[PDB]
Nucleic acid binder design. Sequence first.
RNA 1: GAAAUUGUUGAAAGGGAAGGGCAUUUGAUCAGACA
RNA 2: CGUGGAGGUCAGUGACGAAGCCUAGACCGUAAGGUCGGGUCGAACGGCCUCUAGUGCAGAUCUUGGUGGUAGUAGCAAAUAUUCAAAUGAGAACUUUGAAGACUGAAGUGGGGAAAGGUUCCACGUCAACAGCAGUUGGACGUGGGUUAGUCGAUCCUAAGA
RNA 3: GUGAACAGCCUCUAGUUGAUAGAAUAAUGUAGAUAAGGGAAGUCGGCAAAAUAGAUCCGUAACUUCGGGAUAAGGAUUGGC
Lengths: 386, 63, 109, 183
Amino acid sequence: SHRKYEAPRHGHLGFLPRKRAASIRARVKAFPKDDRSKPVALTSFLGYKAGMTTIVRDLDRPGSKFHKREVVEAVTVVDTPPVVVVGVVGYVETPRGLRSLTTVWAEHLSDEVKRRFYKNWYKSKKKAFTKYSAKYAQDGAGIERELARIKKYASVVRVLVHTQIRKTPLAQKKAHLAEIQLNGGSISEKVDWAREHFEKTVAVDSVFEQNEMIDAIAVTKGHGFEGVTHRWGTKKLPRKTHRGLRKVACIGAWHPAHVMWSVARAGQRGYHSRTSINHKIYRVGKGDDEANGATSFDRTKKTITPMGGFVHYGEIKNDFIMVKGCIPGNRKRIVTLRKSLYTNTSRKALEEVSLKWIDTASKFGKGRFQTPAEKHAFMGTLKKDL
Amino acid sequence: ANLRTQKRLAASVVGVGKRKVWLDPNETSEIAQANSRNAIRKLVKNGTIVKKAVTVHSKSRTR
Amino acid sequence: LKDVVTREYTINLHKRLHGVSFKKRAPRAVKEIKKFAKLHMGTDDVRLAPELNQAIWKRGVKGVEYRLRLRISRKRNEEEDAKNPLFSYVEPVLVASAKGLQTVVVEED
Amino acid sequence: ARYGATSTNPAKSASARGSYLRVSFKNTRETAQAINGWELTKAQKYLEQVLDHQRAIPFRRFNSSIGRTAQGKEFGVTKARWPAKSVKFVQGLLQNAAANAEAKGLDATKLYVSHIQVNQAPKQRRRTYRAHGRINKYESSPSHIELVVTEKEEAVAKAAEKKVVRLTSRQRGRIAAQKRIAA
RNA sequence: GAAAUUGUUGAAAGGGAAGGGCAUUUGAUCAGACA
RNA sequence: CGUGGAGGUCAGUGACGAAGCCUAGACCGUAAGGUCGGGUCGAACGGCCUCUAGUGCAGAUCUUGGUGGUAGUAGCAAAUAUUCAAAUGAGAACUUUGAAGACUGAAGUGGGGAAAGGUUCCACGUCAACAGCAGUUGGACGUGGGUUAGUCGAUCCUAAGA
RNA sequence: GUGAACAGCCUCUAGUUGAUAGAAUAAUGUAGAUAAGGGAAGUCGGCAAAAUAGAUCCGUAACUUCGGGAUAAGGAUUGGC
Ligand SMILES: [Mg+2]
Ligand SMILES: [Mg+2]
Ligand SMILES: [Mg+2]
Ligand SMILES: [Mg+2]
Ligand SMILES: [Mg+2]
Ligand SMILES: [Mg+2]
Ligand SMILES: [Mg+2]
Ligand SMILES: [Mg+2]
Ligand SMILES: [Mg+2]
Ligand SMILES: [Mg+2]
Ligand SMILES: [Mg+2]
Ligand SMILES: [Mg+2]
Ligand SMILES: [Mg+2]
Ligand SMILES: [Mg+2]
Ligand SMILES: [Mg+2]
Ligand SMILES: [Mg+2]
Ligand SMILES: [Mg+2]
Ligand SMILES: [Mg+2]
Ligand SMILES: [Mg+2]
Ligand SMILES: [Mg+2]
Ligand SMILES: [Mg+2]
Ligand SMILES: [Mg+2]
Ligand SMILES: [Mg+2]
Ligand SMILES: [Mg+2]
Ligand SMILES: [Mg+2]
Ligand SMILES: [Mg+2]
Ligand SMILES: [Mg+2]
Ligand SMILES: [Mg+2]
Ligand SMILES: [Mg+2]
Ligand SMILES: [Mg+2]
Ligand SMILES: [Mg+2]
Ligand SMILES: [Mg+2]
Ligand SMILES: [Mg+2]
Ligand SMILES: [Mg+2]
Ligand SMILES: [Mg+2]
Ligand SMILES: [Mg+2]
Ligand SMILES: [Mg+2]
Ligand SMILES: [Mg+2]
Ligand SMILES: [Mg+2]
Ligand SMILES: [Mg+2]
Ligand SMILES: [Mg+2]
Ligand SMILES: [Mg+2]
Ligand SMILES: [Mg+2]
Ligand SMILES: [Mg+2]
Ligand SMILES: [Mg+2]
Ligand SMILES: [Mg+2]
Ligand SMILES: [Mg+2]
Ligand SMILES: [Mg+2]
Ligand SMILES: [Mg+2]
Ligand SMILES: [Mg+2]
Ligand SMILES: [Mg+2]
Ligand SMILES: [Mg+2]
Ligand SMILES: [Mg+2]
Ligand SMILES: [Mg+2]
Ligand SMILES: [Mg+2]
Ligand SMILES: [Mg+2]
Ligand SMILES: [Mg+2]
Ligand SMILES: [Mg+2]
Ligand SMILES: [Mg+2]
Ligand SMILES: [Mg+2]
Ligand SMILES: [Mg+2]
Ligand SMILES: [Mg+2]
Ligand SMILES: [Mg+2]
Ligand SMILES: [Mg+2]
Ligand SMILES: [Mg+2]
Ligand SMILES: [Mg+2]
Ligand SMILES: [Mg+2]
Ligand SMILES: [Mg+2]
Ligand SMILES: [Mg+2]
Ligand SMILES: [Mg+2]
Ligand SMILES: [Mg+2]
Ligand SMILES: [Mg+2]
């Protein structure tokens, strides 16, 4: 008859269907535009999300009432050991869109990837790639011509890398394998890069740097079957209502005589693909560096790992990426950090941060202490100890 | 094997509630033959069936 | 094959009973233990000593101790031949405190 | 006797029945079908595993609003169940068929279940009381069960017709020519 | 010892009903008539 | 055209198989229907002229009986609560005994009665049905046993009333 | 026993431990609870809920049929030894 009062609908029709994703590893739907004048480099990177903590830094933002004043900011830490290059895949343009014509693979593959190619490793004969590997024997003949073929054709080149999940506190042995588009040089320079890097290893610093705006592609946490109130942000029906009240009262007018695609309904919540953008890098840490979590201004030798270690994760003994604020996905989940699709000129983006302090107290309770040393200093000797 | 009867019989004979007649599980074959109050009386007299003590309700905290 | 062993374990009933409804806590503990026996001795046949029952229920349904010290004995079976030749008998061990002990073999004689 | 349609050497078969059994007709129908044509020895081990919840019985007709289980994958099915009482009656008749086979002197190694059919015994009536003073029927659906075990026999040889060939004047002349021409 | 309704066996069809009309292909099946 | 009975007739059919029933086999009729074969079956039945009527079903929220899809679905969620082991038994979550954990909490889930029921009491046997799982258990099933008065009641008396 | 108490709660004697069971703990429920800051803005309407409460002492208004209104209102106190 006409609402009565006007109000915005609940939730965003451009994130439908609200189904579980087809995979834990969210897909990269787009890579940065290519500029073949720059050197060849990855355009993204895998890691695992470790946890969060707090930061302190002076703000640089003329005209803001917090110009030149400290702010405290939340940040996430994603564990980021070097990635290892094991293949190259060459795509070609067609009136039906991008098609892959060949994949060339490294000759040796770590059991870490090989494991990915299996559903029952322990029982299996692990024959994966054992004939492929033999292709190298014959001087190189058939590998060169696939390489040759990628060069002759190919509108784009992506490289095949995987994670070193064993350098990670996780229990799940089976590594993550993925295509990252290469963006420097000529197509031919790209595959040269690719061949050169087989079995060899690549580091975040070769792909990201401080103060850069990056995006994160990941599968959202899971919540299983959710009713309408919390899944769509629908208003609780009144207390008096029969037949329950976390619902939608009217599921549609009489005509169309069909429930419509655009009304809220109970069903799965979370475990969605998301592509979240513009997360500034606050730290590019290095695994082989005590004072990881130390600062120009702090100075105390200590790493990012909180007392007792990241809750529900472990320790971080690898390079990491420290990103302002929060990111889709949970602790332990694979996560693609991606290069921005545009040069952002925001001033907010552009600002060059310098951490003055990284929180490092336990997250398993009300952390009172940054280090075991500080905690000894304050408590003195206890009944154990010396 | 079904000592229900002999237990009721036991309660009545001793003067106590069934909640307190003990029918000894290693003399079940002998107990089962005790159809009569005379045979339960003998079964009580020699310890095949015992009275089982009251549950104390001490008054010591009252006192 | 067979094997016939006795060892003494301490089972963490606390993390196994975490969350369980108050009127299932001592009942869960019976099942939980049984399950704990099979996992170690590989045996589907687990009998609990009546004393172990008492130990378990010593404080009523919802008051199970956080840690029991158990003795588990893999024994061979006799009579009307069962599905499996082996079975475990679980017993309480009179220890002052079930806190701080590690799993231990008991020499057979 | 007088079982359903069978197509089988009775000299090489044995058989068994239970009439009026108080098992669910629908559940034991699905479990009979789960066994139909099985090597006798394979089938027996199979029912044993059903009872152990290690494999399931696929429910293919009497199955709407049944649950789902990974144990239906091997049968290409998502709904499958574990009908204890059904399984035990069937293996009862099954074990009987075995005995009868031993009696006849049939090789127990070749036995497959070649016929297995359940259908509906007369229902048995009980009643339940419903709101507002009403009565409803509360009924059993018993089953008749019958099966036949047969010694499996290989081969079959050939032999049949010869197809009498009939062709016109113009048709046998071309033929006469095909030879007169070539080979 | 019918029908509704059911099990098994055999044969066939089945991209949001089924069933029906006129016509023919294909399969299966069968009467007659030749002398 | 078809049905139940009746008069006549065909010296009609039939235990060497009447009637009936089944049958994407045959044939006659525009059709109502009629005829055959085969299977099943078991004691009676049909053609023609004619007589007669309780004489033809898809319906009537028709009558009585039977049967489906619904569906192995709704459900079997009030009354705090169950556990270990032995014994018995083809079979034990559910029977018996032991142990333990609890409950009712003397305004009782204790110990008796009035009305009502009528054998349910008790013993031995025992599970086809019944006790909306089970069952070796039962207020079930089978077979037996059992209710003792000068003093307890009735009986006597009178009440409203009959 | 507590206590004003034949209340509630715990217990002795007696009697039960009967009420299909197993596994998980999605939505939505039924029944039981809690919520920062605000405080009826919700709603036909404070519906529901929350607040109050025992006892000892202090102290209690309009009005009145002089009996009341009145536990008016409003306060303090309360264990153990
Ligand atoms: Mg408008
Ligand atoms: Mg899928
Ligand atoms: Mg190719
Ligand atoms: Mg919720
Ligand atoms: Mg909202
Ligand atoms: Mg939200
Ligand atoms: Mg209402
Ligand atoms: Mg709503
Ligand atoms: Mg914390
Ligand atoms: Mg919980
Ligand atoms: Mg029959
Ligand atoms: Mg059906
Ligand atoms: Mg169905
Ligand atoms: Mg279902
Ligand atoms: Mg459905
Ligand atoms: Mg299916
Ligand atoms: Mg009812
Ligand atoms: Mg009624
Ligand atoms: Mg011819
Ligand atoms: Mg020619
Ligand atoms: Mg008959
Ligand atoms: Mg047609
Ligand atoms: Mg046609
Ligand atoms: Mg006529
Ligand atoms: Mg007539
Ligand atoms: Mg008549
Ligand atoms: Mg005939
Ligand atoms: Mg027909
Ligand atoms: Mg003819
Ligand atoms: Mg005939
Ligand atoms: Mg006769
Ligand atoms: Mg006439
Ligand atoms: Mg009439
Ligand atoms: Mg009509
Ligand atoms: Mg009709
Ligand atoms: Mg009709
Ligand atoms: Mg009509
Ligand atoms: Mg009708
Ligand atoms: Mg009816
Ligand atoms: Mg059923
Ligand atoms: Mg159900
Ligand atoms: Mg209900
Ligand atoms: Mg029970
Ligand atoms: Mg109590
Ligand atoms: Mg009381
Ligand atoms: Mg009772
Ligand atoms: Mg009495
Ligand atoms: Mg009575
Ligand atoms: Mg009795
Ligand atoms: Mg029975
Ligand atoms: Mg009854
Ligand atoms: Mg029953
Ligand atoms: Mg029964
Ligand atoms: Mg009797
Ligand atoms: Mg009698
Ligand atoms: Mg007198
Ligand atoms: Mg007298
Ligand atoms: Mg009683
Ligand atoms: Mg009930
Ligand atoms: Mg209850
Ligand atoms: Mg349940
Ligand atoms: Mg509040
Ligand atoms: Mg206020
Ligand atoms: Mg208002
Ligand atoms: Mg106000
Ligand atoms: Mg309003
Ligand atoms: Mg009003
Ligand atoms: Mg108003
Ligand atoms: Mg109210
Ligand atoms: Mg409050
Ligand atoms: Mg007043
Ligand atoms: Mg004081």
